[PDB]
Design an enzyme around this catalytic site. Sequence first.
Site, short mmCIF file in Angstrom:
data_model
loop_
_atom_site.label_atom_id
_atom_site.label_comp_id
_atom_site.label_asym_id
_atom_site.label_seq_id
_atom_site.Cartn_x
_atom_site.Cartn_y
_atom_site.Cartn_z
N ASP A 139 0.82 -1.21 0.07
CA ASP A 139 -0.01 -0.16 -0.09
C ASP A 139 0.93 1.54 0.01
OD1 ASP A 139 -2.57 1.27 0.08
OD2 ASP A 139 -2.45 1.48 2.28
N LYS A 142 2.75 3.56 -5.66
CA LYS A 142 2.29 2.71 -6.60
C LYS A 142 3.23 2.19 -7.56
CE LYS A 142 -1.32 3.26 -3.98
NZ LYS A 142 -0.80 2.51 -2.68
N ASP A 167 -3.39 -3.25 -2.50
CA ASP A 167 -4.37 -2.14 -2.45
C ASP A 167 -4.20 -1.36 -3.73
OD1 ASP A 167 -6.44 -0.62 -1.44
OD2 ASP A 167 -5.31 0.62 -0.08
N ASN A 168 -5.38 -0.76 -4.08
CA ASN A 168 -5.23 0.53 -5.19
C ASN A 168 -5.01 -0.14 -6.53
OD1 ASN A 168 -3.91 2.03 -2.59
ND2 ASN A 168 -5.88 2.55 -3.24
N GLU A 197 -11.50 3.88 -0.60
CA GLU A 197 -11.68 4.47 0.72
C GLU A 197 -12.55 5.65 0.76
OE1 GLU A 197 -8.48 3.61 -0.49
OE2 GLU A 197 -7.14 5.15 0.26
O1 LIG Z 1 -0.48 6.88 -2.97
C1 LIG Z 1 -1.21 5.98 -2.13
N1 LIG Z 1 -0.53 5.55 -1.08
C2 LIG Z 1 0.93 5.66 -1.05
C3 LIG Z 1 1.44 6.72 0.04
C4 LIG Z 1 2.60 6.24 0.47
C5 LIG Z 1 3.24 7.52 1.51
O2 LIG Z 1 2.77 8.61 1.21
C6 LIG Z 1 2.16 9.34 2.70
C7 LIG Z 1 2.83 8.38 3.66
O3 LIG Z 1 4.32 8.73 3.88
C8 LIG Z 1 2.96 6.96 2.89
O4 LIG Z 1 3.66 5.71 3.27
C9 LIG Z 1 -2.85 6.18 -2.25
C10 LIG Z 1 -3.55 7.18 -2.63
C11 LIG Z 1 -4.79 7.18 -2.92
N2 LIG Z 1 -5.43 7.95 -3.85
O5 LIG Z 1 -6.65 7.86 -3.93
O6 LIG Z 1 -4.60 8.96 -4.17
C12 LIG Z 1 -5.39 5.81 -2.43
C13 LIG Z 1 -4.70 5.14 -1.50
O7 LIG Z 1 -5.46 4.01 -0.93
C14 LIG Z 1 -3.20 5.13 -1.53
O8 LIG Z 1 -2.62 4.07 -0.73
CL LIG Z 2 -4.04 2.59 5.93
MG LIG Z 3 -4.17 2.57 -0.25
#
Ligand SMILES: O=C(NC/C=C/[C@H]1OC[C@H](O)[C@@H]1O)c1cc([N+](=O)[O-])cc(O)c1O
Ligand SMILES: [Cl-]
Ligand SMILES: [Mg+2]
Length: 213
Positions: A139, A142, A167-168, A197
């Site tokens: 997660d 990406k 995820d995602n 989410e």
């Molecule tokens: O970038 C996403 N996740 C990666 C983020 C990784 C790092 O960014 C903030 C924190 O340091 C984390 O480890 C993401 C983005 C969305 N979205 O809709 O943008 C939805 C999700 O469930 C996500 O996991």
């Molecule tokens: Cl989470």
């Molecule tokens: Mg996610």
Amino acid sequence: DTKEQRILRYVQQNAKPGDPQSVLEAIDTYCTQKEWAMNVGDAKGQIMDAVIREYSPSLVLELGAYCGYSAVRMARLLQPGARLLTMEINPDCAAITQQMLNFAGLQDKVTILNGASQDLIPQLKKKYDVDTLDMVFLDHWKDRYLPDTLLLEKCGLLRKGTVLLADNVIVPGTPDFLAYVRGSSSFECTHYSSYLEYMKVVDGLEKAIYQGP
Ligand SMILES: O=C(NC/C=C/[C@H]1OC[C@H](O)[C@@H]1O)c1cc([N+](=O)[O-])cc(O)c1O
Ligand SMILES: [Cl-]
Ligand SMILES: [Mg+2]
């Protein structure tokens, strides 16, 4: 003051200490009613819960803790003696995740690793007393899903039957990872359709079970 600190404070103010379910519920309420945030959420979370209960993993690796929502979600279902290791590249988030787990009463089961996945993965076996992983939750960034999977494999961290759960895979999407696991005879894949989410947008989790080299 950051979004993430506001979520932590709301949990401290509203959830019951030592009650993981209450923590999850307060996070989900805050992100539903006040501020969207990238927690896995309750809908995908129920699917996660079902997968964890099915496999009863003894050693889980999480890539990307964020605020610790999924760390809390997974650790509350771990059997006694089982361990979650969670990697978080941002030290502010890694701090918040530690506080979230502390509040939930889960700190004994969870070990937070501060760093980039690509740097931490090769140190797992020696520094964290790991042989092979039973389950991996992806997660984080990406674009890191595929190269970190290849690195897990390189470093001998996957065994036959290791469950990767990502995820995602639709939104924002992980198209290289998904092509790879679905095309490879080393992985048996299952897609679980769900929702992003706190929203009506279609997303899903992919389960990819490593079959051996
Ligand atoms: O970038 C996403 N996740 C990666 C983020 C990784 C790092 O960014 C903030 C924190 O340091 C984390 O480890 C993401 C983005 C969305 N979205 O809709 O943008 C939805 C999700 O469930 C996500 O996991
Ligand atoms: Cl989470
Ligand atoms: Mg996610």
